[PDB]
Amino acid sequence: VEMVDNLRGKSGQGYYVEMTVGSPPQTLNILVDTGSSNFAVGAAPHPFLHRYYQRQLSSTYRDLRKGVYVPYTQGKWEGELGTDLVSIPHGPNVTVRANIAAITESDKFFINGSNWEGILGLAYAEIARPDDSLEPFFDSLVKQTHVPNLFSLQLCGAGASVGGSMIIGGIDHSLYTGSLWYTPIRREWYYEVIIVRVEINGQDLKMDCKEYNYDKSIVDSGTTNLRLPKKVFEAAVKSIKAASSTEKFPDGFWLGEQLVCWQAGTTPWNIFPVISLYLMGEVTNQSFRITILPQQYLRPVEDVATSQDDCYKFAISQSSTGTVMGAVIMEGFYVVFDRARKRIGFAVSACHVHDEFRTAAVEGPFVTLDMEDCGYN
Numbered sequence: 014v015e016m017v018d019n020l021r022g023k024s025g026q027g028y029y030v031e032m033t034v035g036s037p038p039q040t041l042n043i044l045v046d047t048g049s050s051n052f053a054v055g056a057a058p059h060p061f062l063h064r065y066y067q068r069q070l071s072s073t074y075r076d077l078r079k080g081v082y083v084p085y086t087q088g089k090w091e092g093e094l095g096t097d098l099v100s101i102p103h104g105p106n107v108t109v110r111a112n113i114a115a116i117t118e119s120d121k122f123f124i125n126g127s128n129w130e131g132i133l134g135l136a137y138a139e140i141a142r143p144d145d146s147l148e149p150f151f152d153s154l155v156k157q158t159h160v161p162n163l164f165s166l167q168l169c170g171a172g173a174s175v176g177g178s179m180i181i182g183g184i185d186h187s188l189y190t191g192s193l194w195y196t197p198i199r200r201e202w203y204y205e206v207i208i209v210r211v212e213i214n215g216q217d218l219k220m221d222c223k224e225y226n227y228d229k230s231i232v233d234s235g236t237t238n239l240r241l242p243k244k245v246f247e248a249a250v251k252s253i254k255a256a257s258s259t260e261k262f263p264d265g266f267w268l269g270e271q272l273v274c275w276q277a278g279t280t281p282w283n284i285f286p287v288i289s290l291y292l293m294g295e296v297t298n299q300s301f302r303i304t305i306l307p308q309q310y311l312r313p314v315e316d317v318a319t320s321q322d323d324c325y326k327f328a329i330s331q332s333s334t335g336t337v338m339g340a341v342i343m344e345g346f347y348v349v350f351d352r353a354r355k356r357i358g359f360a361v362s363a364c365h366v367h368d369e370f371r372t373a374a375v376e377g378p379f380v381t382l383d384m385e386d387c388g389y390n
């Protein structure tokens with residue numbers, strides 16, 4: 014379809030889709046964020062913005078006379094709410110009127126050279142700012158068009174420049190192989206899921222499974238890393254250390270604050286373990302596992318200055334706000350946000366990035382006898 018390959022990005026800086034806002038249409042690149050629910054676009058000059066939404070030029074702009082403030086994990090923005098016409102040139106062939114936050118100030122939000130000027134929050138109204146009566150974009154799209162209430166994401170991030178597809182209203186079979194496995198959306202606010210087991214090199218971390226979901230677990234295209242609650246993060250780091258102990262790395266590396274570097278072409282993929290995350294299935298006590306390679310959790314950092322080497326950041330980090338299944342872990346899966354059936358599907362994507370020894374996988378079913386609910390609260 015004309016929807017394939019409509020995402021672009023730079024590694025670590027998010028993936029974006031081209032959109033238009035206003036009439037006549039103004040073209041902007043917009044970050045695709047399943048971890049939030051506000052649609053906001055740069056609307057005043059900023060050093061890092063190539064362009065921005067000029068409301069004065071749009072005859073369809075309607076001002077809502079209400080300010081809005083959104084604080085994320087590090088960055089934040091503030092702006093003014095209004096509505097306008099919005100299209101996605103390489104998405105469905107439709108036009109919708111949607112809420113739009115016109116960002117007028119921000120701190121640590123825009124990224125120097127990222128090539129996007131806005132953010133599309135694809136999560137549910139419950140977490141929209143100022144409050145849940147601010148209808149999110151996807152909800153407006155569904156209410157206003159015949160578009161089925163589902164979207165899928167194939168994030169590739171191949172080899173600085175990355176790409177992918179966002180398919181709205183459907184499942185494109187050309188984008189995955191093998192089966193689709195579904196995990197229930199536990200609560201419609203973030204895309205909240207439940208992890209029931211974690212293995213490193215097939216070794217179970219042996220924790221009460223509530224710990225994996227302390228205090229929610231989410232699927233978040235707007236966060237780069239796999240983020241893990243402290244207790245789980247330290248347990249994981251210990252095993253991955255143990256598995257790779259033929260080489261020793263500085264603590265700074267494990268903290269995500271220092272690169273590790275090897276002479277180009279010589280990264281020792283084989284010393285690093287795979288990581289399996291088992292997700293609650295659609296039937297009681299059944300699960301499936303998604304298995305991730307170090308090619309996804311060792312994120313390359315492109316830098317012409319360090320380019321006699323290949324250099325990497327460790328893309329697993331600690332969270333005090335729950336587990337976040339970020340871009341790391343979505344890359345090389347085809348992930349189906351099936352809102353209509355309150356579930357999220359995972360399959361191996363046409364762009365999985367594997368060894369001649371190992372491959373990322375989505376596989377099941379697994380059964381557990383332990384009658385314990387893994388949901389935290």
Ligand SMILES: CC(=O)N[C@@H](Cc1ccccc1)[C@H](O)CN[C@H]1CC(C)(C)Oc2sc(CC(C)(C)C)cc21
Pocket residue numbers: 027044046048049050083084085086087088121122123132140141142231233235236237334337
């Ligand atoms: C790393 C990050 O903060 N990603 C944001 C999206 C973003 C993209 C580019 C620049 C800055 C931010 C993503 O929305 C974060 N997703 C969740 C993650 C969690 C750990 C649950 O923390 C937060 S706070 C938040 C904003 C509200 C939904 C609370 C308004 C969304 C999220």
